[PDB]
Structure formats: structure tokens, C-alpha cells
Amino acid sequence: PVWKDADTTLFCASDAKAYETEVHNVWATHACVPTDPNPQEIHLENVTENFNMWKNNMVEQMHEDIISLWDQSLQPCVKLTGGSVIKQACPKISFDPIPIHYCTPAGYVILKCNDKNFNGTGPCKNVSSVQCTHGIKPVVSTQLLLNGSLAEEEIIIRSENLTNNAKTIIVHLNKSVEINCTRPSDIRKAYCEINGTKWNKVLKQVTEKLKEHFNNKTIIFQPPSGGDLEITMHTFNCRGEFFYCNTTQLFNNTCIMKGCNGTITLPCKIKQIINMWQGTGQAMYAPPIDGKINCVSNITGILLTRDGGANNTSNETFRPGGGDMRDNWRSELYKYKVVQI
Ligand SMILES: COC(=O)N1CCC[C@H](C(=O)Nc2ccc(Cl)c(F)c2)C1
Ligand SMILES: *[C@@H]1O[C@H](CO)[C@@H](O)[C@H](O)[C@H]1NC(C)=O
Ligand SMILES: *[C@@H]1O[C@H](CO)[C@@H](O)[C@H](O)[C@H]1NC(C)=O
Ligand SMILES: *[C@@H]1O[C@H](CO)[C@@H](O)[C@H](O)[C@H]1NC(C)=O
Ligand SMILES: *[C@@H]1O[C@H](CO)[C@@H](O)[C@H](O)[C@H]1NC(C)=O
Ligand SMILES: *[C@@H]1O[C@H](CO)[C@@H](O)[C@H](O)[C@H]1NC(C)=O
Ligand SMILES: *[C@@H]1O[C@H](CO)[C@@H](O)[C@H](O)[C@H]1NC(C)=O
Ligand SMILES: *[C@@H]1O[C@H](CO)[C@@H](O)[C@H](O)[C@H]1NC(C)=O
Ligand SMILES: *[C@@H]1O[C@H](CO)[C@@H](O)[C@H](O)[C@H]1NC(C)=O
Ligand SMILES: *[C@@H]1O[C@H](CO)[C@@H](O)[C@H](O)[C@H]1NC(C)=O
Ligand SMILES: *[C@@H]1O[C@H](CO)[C@@H](O)[C@H](O)[C@H]1NC(C)=O
Ligand SMILES: *[C@@H]1O[C@H](CO)[C@@H](O)[C@H](O)[C@H]1NC(C)=O
Numbered sequence: 001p002v003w004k005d006a007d008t009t010l011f012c013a014s015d016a017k018a019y020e021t022e023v024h025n026v027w028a029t030h031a032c033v034p035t036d037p038n039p040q041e042i043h044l045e046n047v048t049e050n051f052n053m054w055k056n057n058m059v060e061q062m063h064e065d066i067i068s069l070w071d072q073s074l075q076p077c078v079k080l081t082g083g084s085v086i087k088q089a090c091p092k093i094s095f096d097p098i099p100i101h102y103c104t105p106a107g108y109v110i111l112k113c114n115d116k117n118f119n120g121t122g123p124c125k126n127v128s129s130v131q132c133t134h135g136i137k138p139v140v141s142t143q144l145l146l147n148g149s150l151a152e153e154e155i156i157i158r159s160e161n162l163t164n165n166a167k168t169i170i171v172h173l174n175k176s177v178e179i180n181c182t183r184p185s186d187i188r189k190a191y192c193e194i195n196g197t198k199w200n201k202v203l204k205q206v207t208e209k210l211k212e213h214f215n216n217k218t219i220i221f222q223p224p225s226g227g228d229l230e231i232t233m234h235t236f237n238c239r240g241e242f243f244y245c246n247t248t249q250l251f252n253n254t255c256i257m258k259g260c261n262g263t264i265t266l267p268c269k270i271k272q273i274i275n276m277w278q279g280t281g282q283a284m285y286a287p288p289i290d291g292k293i294n295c296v297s298n299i300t301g302i303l304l305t306r307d308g309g310a311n312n313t314s315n316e317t318f319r320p321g322g323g324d325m326r327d328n329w330r331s332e333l334y335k336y337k338v339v340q341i
Pocket of ligand 12: 097146236239294296297
């Protein structure tokens, strides 16, 4: 059919409800068009196409969208940016992500890799074309990727360069793991419950898959090596509240029989004052709503950074990472790319 690699401005589509006060719905109601009522995916016969999830302008575009959404939607009591501050009103909002589709304009199409074990870079042999991506939830989080899609076959390790330890690793799970987080009815104290059995089994498999890529070496997990709390903790937004959860128990190493196939309870705190993931500085929000604040989510992936300086050692050490939300969008946009017809 003839196409070439190209960049261009996308638009978005949604099933947002015009009658909803939820912020993602409000934003998508006025910034996206309705979802394609009859989506058509066209398989491309005997077509091999190179992809590179690490060099994908769709990622930067979605990133700019979600920045826009959060800036219009979240109302901090005070926000400190660029040697300045502005104080406002900060009402509690309705907050629950909805899927967003990304669609090409005229003269362009989206190619979709359906190779089940595709790692994000290189050739894809089973390629289709679509007018829009599937609906992607823009879930902001560190350490754990939440409410995403799953790898269809095996656990996938995605990295721009595994030998470069400064390059973030995205682990794509093939089996979701529930994380159930609650502030019951100290108002800022909360906790997350994870099935230890389910989690440790998944984690043992992740270690095995990491061993395949690192010449059979010993794989050890460690807590983050300092930084801001947003990256030292699993950080996410739950119904408008910013949860900071300690994941030391998640990355034990011991449980990979010692009394650890029960429930894992991670200590959390709701924080009013955060370091924004947009990079702009510090923001302060209002105290949490009264009553039971609950969010149950699927762990669909893991963000990891590997220690340096272990070349002459027998081990490789991995720590939960994150903070660059582009990697969150990357973990869902990896199989898409825009081409010009
Ligand atoms: C990594 O380098 C940076 O520029 N950062 C500055 C310090 C951490 C910040 C961050 O990740 N904040 C955040 C806020 C809210 C949520 Cl719900 C979240 F999941 C992450 C990113
Ligand atoms: C991804 O697959 C390509 C082969 O097409 C290979 O060059 C690259 O090392 C792989 N990356 C990872 C992280 O497995
Ligand atoms: C090609 O990908 C399609 C679309 O996901 C999928 O049904 C299947 O795995 C592949 N089909 C063939 C004939 O290989
Ligand atoms: C979590 O995963 C299960 C199956 O793995 C799925 O049925 C459920 O809808 C998922 N929840 C969300 C919020 O995606
Ligand atoms: C997930 O992938 C691993 C290999 O990485 C495999 O051993 C396991 O059976 C897979 N699980 C499912 C449910 O497909
Ligand atoms: C990957 O990183 C290593 C170490 O930083 C570097 O020597 C190598 O050239 C990199 N590979 C590519 C393809 O950039
Ligand atoms: C989540 O945890 C809360 C508090 O522990 C509990 O009331 C609720 O039943 C749990 N929900 C699920 C879906 O497991
Ligand atoms: C963990 O998953 C097992 C299945 O392996 C299930 O029977 C049980 O409900 C779960 N236990 C906890 C404590 O979540
Ligand atoms: C890693 O060790 C396994 C046995 O545990 C072996 O089958 C495999 O050949 C080794 N890795 C590679 C890349 O050969
Ligand atoms: C997480 O909890 C452990 C104890 O389980 C504690 O030593 C550590 O300081 C906590 N992490 C942070 C960032 O406070
Ligand atoms: C898991 O986490 C902590 C280590 O700080 C501890 O409660 C426990 O002994 C560890 N290992 C096992 C097998 O439970
Ligand atoms: C994940 O999805 C569930 C169901 O859609 C929702 O209740 C939960 O709040 C979501 N988690 C996050 C962190 O958005």
C-alpha cells in the first residue's frame, strides 16, 4: 500500500459522559471526539515492519495531553513553580481515569504490532493497521504500572539498552496482581493489601526472565537508593488523594515457606504536599475526604533500574524506579507507530 515513517499531530477519542463531573470525562468531553463507532483493523499480508517503542512521538504527544488534563483538573490550594507561587481554592474533585484512544488524521495511519512476544524494538512480522489505538487509561504512578494491559504470552523485558544501567526497564507482566488500597473511616494513614502468594510467584518468574537476559547471573531486588518520596515509594492517585506506599515488603528477596504466602500489607500515607511529575515543582492539596477511601487496581507491570558497577560481580541488583511518566505511556503505546501513506 506504500507508507513511510512519519510524525504528525494526533487527535483523541473517548467514551466520556457529557453529564459527568469526573475530571477525565470533563476533559475528554471537550478535548476529544467520540470513540469510533465502527473500528476497523486491517491485517497487512506478508508485511514486516520495524518498530521502536523508545523513539515514538506518540509517547510525547500523549504525555503533553495528560499534563494538560492534570493542569486543568487538579486544583491545589497553593502551587509553587519557577520562583513564584499562586494560591487559589482547592475543592475535592471526582477523579477516576478513563481510556483514551489516539487517532491519526487524514493521510496517515497507525501500524500495530501483534507479535505476542515483541519486546518493543525491531521487526514485527504480524502487523495490522488501525485508525486509532485501543483505549489507554492514563494512570500516573511510580514503581508499579497500574490498570494497564498484559503481555499475551510470556513476561516481557523492555529496555532501550539493557547493558546501559541508566536506562529504565519496563517489565510487562502476563498475569495481573491485585493491589487493594484503603484509608479506613490519623486521617492520612492508609495501607495496601496484596496476595503474597500471587505476588511472589509472579516475582519469581520475573527474576527467571531477568536471568535469561543477564547471562544466568543472580538476580537480587533492593529498595530504592534514596531520592524523592515519589520514587522511593509506590506513588499513585486514588480518587483524588495521593497515596505514598512503602514497597520494601514487595521486593524482599527472601520469599523467592518462611511464613510469607499470606496477605502483604504495605504501609501508606496520603500526602497533601507533592513533587509534581510534570517537573514544575511543589503543589499542596486539601486534606482527604471523610470516610473509606478505596482503590483496587491491577498491577500490570514493573518499573526497574539496575545498579551499576557490578560488571566483575556475580549479581545484578534491581530497584523499583519511575518518575518519568513517559515510560507509563510507553508500556501501552509500544506496539503502535504512525506512518504516512
Ligand atoms: C524523576 O524526576 C522528576 O522530575 N520528578 C521529581 C520528583 C518526583 C516526581 C514524581 O514522580 N511525582 C509524582 C506525583 C504524583 C503521582 Cl500520583 C506520581 F505517581 C508521581 C518526578
Ligand atoms: C529486542 O529484540 C531485538 C531483536 O529484534 C534485540 O536486538 C534486542 O536486544 C531486544 N531487547 C531486549 C530488551 O530483549
Ligand atoms: C496475527 O495477529 C492477529 C491480530 O491480533 C492475531 O489474531 C494472530 O495472532 C495472527 N494471525 C495469524 C494468522 O498469524
Ligand atoms: C484486572 O484484571 C482482570 C483479569 O486479569 C480483569 O478482568 C479486570 O477487568 C482488570 N481490572 C481493571 C480495572 O482493568
Ligand atoms: C508468564 O510468562 C512466564 C515466562 O516469562 C511463563 O512461565 C508463565 O507460564 C506465563 N504465565 C501465563 C499465565 O501465561
Ligand atoms: C548500551 O550501553 C552501553 C553501556 O552504557 C554502551 O557501551 C553501548 O554502546 C550502548 N548500546 C547502544 C546500541 O547504544
Ligand atoms: C479491599 O480491602 C478492604 C479493606 O481491607 C476490604 O473491605 C475489601 O473487601 C477489599 N476488596 C477486595 C475487592 O478485595
Ligand atoms: C491468593 O491467591 C490464591 C490462589 O493462589 C487464592 O486462593 C487466595 O484467595 C489468595 N489469598 C489471599 C490472601 O489473597
Ligand atoms: C543459562 O543456564 C541454563 C541452565 O540453567 C542453560 O540452559 C542456558 O544455556 C544458560 N544461558 C544461555 C544463554 O545459554
Ligand atoms: C519502608 O519500610 C522499611 C521497613 O519495612 C523502612 O526501613 C524504610 O525506611 C521505609 N522506606 C522509606 C522510604 O521510608
Ligand atoms: C520479608 O520482608 C521483611 C524483611 O524486611 C520481613 O518481615 C520478612 O522476614 C521478609 N522475608 C520473609 C521470608 O518473610
Ligand atoms: C484501577 O481500576 C479500577 C476499576 O476501574 C479503579 O477502581 C481503580 O481506582 C483504578 N486504580 C487507579 C490507581 O486508578
